[PDB]
């Protein structure tokens, strides 16, 4: 009864810090992770080391990565109140500038953005430590040739967000990330295309859906860090040339329709962004298909991920003054219920009957130098380590649910599965829940 937040979302952090590629900082809390993928670079030779790995694989998703910073970032700075109450202000800035630190160094020429570092198959045909990876890493990128309009649009919109954050504790820093936002927004809406039709390899696990909204989000993002009506004209007359009022409701890594509405209306305070958002979440609370035990069900793939995606949309419309008490409470009930309310929690290393078998390379790997390959993802026993933090698929529509590292449907993890959830649990500290 009565779940810490604060300790939580600290775990949360933890996961973070379990995710992350290339030199390890000396006050790395995670410590069982070591330095890896230091040779990752570019076709100049670039370094391009750092970044987090994905998922359960060491590849870096350039896409997935982008939008779990702008979330972080997002979070940060509607809900700081949450991290400086856990203790955790410095480490959520350390999330973000992980990862932003990353896009600096992707982001090669002002037109040419690195999208992904590794493979897919040669990276998931390995299961072992990061450090101990032989394979080759290829490194691919788009450019004015191979556009990706909604891999540079996010990426923009992460940055942007990243220099909200440090606009005080950093201001270097904060215009360095600014000044690559500009740059990233300007290459995504002059050359339109979805990065995964040139990152090709990508297509085949984040495939994007559509790149329009990403352009709407980015300039919305990039209208509240430089308060220049230009990117808010645009961002608006985007957001009415492709309809997106009318889009399916939702925000995940593929999509950012609910993101953008909420967000817009926040910066413009216009009735008719408030409205769409009302809609969405009186339709989640009312009517989208949930458990029996109560957890809103979206889909088979991330399923926890989808619910707590949509709590965090809903605390951020209370936020707007729309059913704030409800719309609170039923976000609680989601992330409540990742927490256990259901019978058990699916947060890794936390609460009763956690998961202990996530689908995760180096989490399931002892100490060097015994050896971690194929074996250790064959063995009986729980993970090795503890991910502390990590939230998993989830249970199916029934609330049935089983422990197994090969699943990966209900045991996957993710840097993208972690992002609105953490973003939650700031908010829900901030509001003394
Ligand atoms: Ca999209």
């Given at each position: 009864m009565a779940y810490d937040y604060k300790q939580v979302l600290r775990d949360s952090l933890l996961f973070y810090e379990a995710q992350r590629s290339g030199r390890l900082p000396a006050d790395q809390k995670v410590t069982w992770r070591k330095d890896s993928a230091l040779n990752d670079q570019g076709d100049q030779g670039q370094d391009l080391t750092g970044g987090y790995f994905d998922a359960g694989d060491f590849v870096k998703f350039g896409f997935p990565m982008a939008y779990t910073a702008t979330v972080l970032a997002?979070?940060?700075?509607?809900?700081?109140?949450?991290?400086?109450?856990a203790g955790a202000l410095d480490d959520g800035r350390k999330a973000?500038?992980?990862?932003?630190?990353?896009?600096?160094?992707?982001?090669?020429?002002?037109?040419?953005?690195?999208?992904?570092?590794?493979?897919?198959?040669?990276?998931?045909?390995f299961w072992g430590r990061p450090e101990d990876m032989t394979m080759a890493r290829p490194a691919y990128k788009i450019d004015t040739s191979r556009p990706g309009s909604d891999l540079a649009g996010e990426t923009a919109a992460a940055l942007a967000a990243a220099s909200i954050v440090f606009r005080n504790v950093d201001g270097?820093?904060?215009?360095?990330?600014?000044?690559?936002?500009?740059?990233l927004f300007?290459?995504?809406?002059?050359?339109?295309?979805?990065?995964?039709?040139?990152?090709?390899?990508?297509?085949?696990?984040?495939?994007?859906?559509?790149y329009?909204?990403?352009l709407v989000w980015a300039a919305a993002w990039l209208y509240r860090a430089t308060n220049d009506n230009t990117y808010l004209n645009t961002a608006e007359s985007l957001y009415d040339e492709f309809g997106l009022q009318n889009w399916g409701g939702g925000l995940?890594?593929?999509?950012?329709?609910?993101?953008?509405?909420?967000?817009?209306?926040?910066?413009?305070?216009?009735?008719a962004y408030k409205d769409t958002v009302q809609s969405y979440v009186n339709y989640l609370i009312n009517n989208q298909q949930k458990t029996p035990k109560g957890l809103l069900y979206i889909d088979m793939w991330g399923t926890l991920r989808h619910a707590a995606n949509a709590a965090f949309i809903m605390l951020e419309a209370a936020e707007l003054g729309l059913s704030a008490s409800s719309y609170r409470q039923f976000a609680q009930t989601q992330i409540d219920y990742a927490l256990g309310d259901g019978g058990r929690s699916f947060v890794c290393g936390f609460g009763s009957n956690p998961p202990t078998r996530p689908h995760h390379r180096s989490s399931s790997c002892p100490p060097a130098p015994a050896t971690c390959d194929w074996n250790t993802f064959n063995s009986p026993d729980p993970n090795y380590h503890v991910l502390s933090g990590a939230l998993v698929g989830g249970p199916d529509?029934?609330?049935?649910?089983?422990?197994?590292?090969?699943?990966?449907?209900?045991?996957?993890?993710?840097?993208?599965y972690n992002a609105g959830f953490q973003s939650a649990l700031a908010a829900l500290v901030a509001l003394g829940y």
């Open positions: 997002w979070g940060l700075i509607d809900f700081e109140a949450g991290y400086s109450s973000v500038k992980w990862a932003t630190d990353y896009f600096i160094k992707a982001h090669t020429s002002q037109n040419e953005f690195y999208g992904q570092v590794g493979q897919g198959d040669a990276d998931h045909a270097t820093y904060s215009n360095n990330l600014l000044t690559h936002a500009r740059q300007d290459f995504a809406n002059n050359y339109r295309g979805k990065y995964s039709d040139s990152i090709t390899d990508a297509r085949n696990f984040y495939a994007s859906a559509d329009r909204d990403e995940n890594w593929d999509s950012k329709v609910s993101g953008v509405q909420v967000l817009l209306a926040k910066l413009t305070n216009k009735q529509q029934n609330d049935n649910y089983v422990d197994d590292r090969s699943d990966y449907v209900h045991n996957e993890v993710a840097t993208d």
